[PDB]
Amino acid sequence: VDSAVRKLLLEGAGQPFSEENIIGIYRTPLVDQQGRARFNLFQKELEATKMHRGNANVRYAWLPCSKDTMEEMMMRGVLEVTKPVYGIGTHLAPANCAQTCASYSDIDENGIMRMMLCRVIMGNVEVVLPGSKQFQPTNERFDSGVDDLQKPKHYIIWDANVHRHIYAEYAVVIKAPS
């Protein structure tokens, strides 16, 4: 559903955003450089995790972006991550924490923030400690990390899974407020 982006952005959490703050919302490319349909690949990965774990645990999440990394996606279908003290991996904010991902993302010279709404295959999650140097699942039973099992504020995707479990779906460009 197209409305889900503004749904999460404007009315989602306690802190809202305004339409004037949204510079752009854009779909990501359908194929990567090598012509593979990106959504179909993600569906394939979704089915594989579902069959292995019993549930794929697909979430919406916000990926902090720089100008360059958004360009890699929007020009070439390539996923690049910018450098969240919870392990060595890709850190994402839960769907309702766009303001948190906003407060934890960079603001450039033109007063602009960038982020991407992704569907993420999390699979089985475990706790990652703050300041942890973890870079992979603890053991074969887990796939991804959270900072808190009851009240997650951060999702963590390990390097080995970034190219198969993160599907960037919308690019979002926001003007710093007022």
Numbering used by the authors: 250 to 332, 337 to 431
What text does the study give?
Although the PARP domain in SRO proteins is strictly conserved, residues of the His–Tyr–Glu triad deviate from the consensus sequence in SRO proteins. Liu et al. (2014) proposed that the bread wheat (T. aestivum) Ta-SRO1 protein can catalyze poly-ADP-ribosylation reactions although the His–Tyr–Glu is replaced by Leu–His–His in this protein. We present a structural analysis of the Ta-sro1 PARP domain at 2.1 Å resolution together with in vitro and in vivo assays of biochemical function, providing strong evidence that Ta-sro1 is unlikely to have PARP activity.
The domain adopts the typical PARP fold with a β–α–loop–β–α signature at the donor site that binds NAD+. The structure confirms that the His–Tyr–Glu triad is not conserved in Ta-sro1. The position of the conserved His residue is taken by Ta-sro1 Leu312. The catalytic Glu that is specifically required for the PAR chain elongating polymerase activity of PARPs is replaced by Ta-sro1 His407. However, our Ta-sro1 PARP domain crystal structure reveals that the Ta-sro1 Thr343 side chain points in the opposite direction and toward a hydrophobic area forming the basis of the postulated NAD+-binding site. The second polymorphic amino acid, Val250 (Gly in Ta-SRO1) is positioned on the opposite side of the domain and located close to the N-terminus of the crystallized construct.
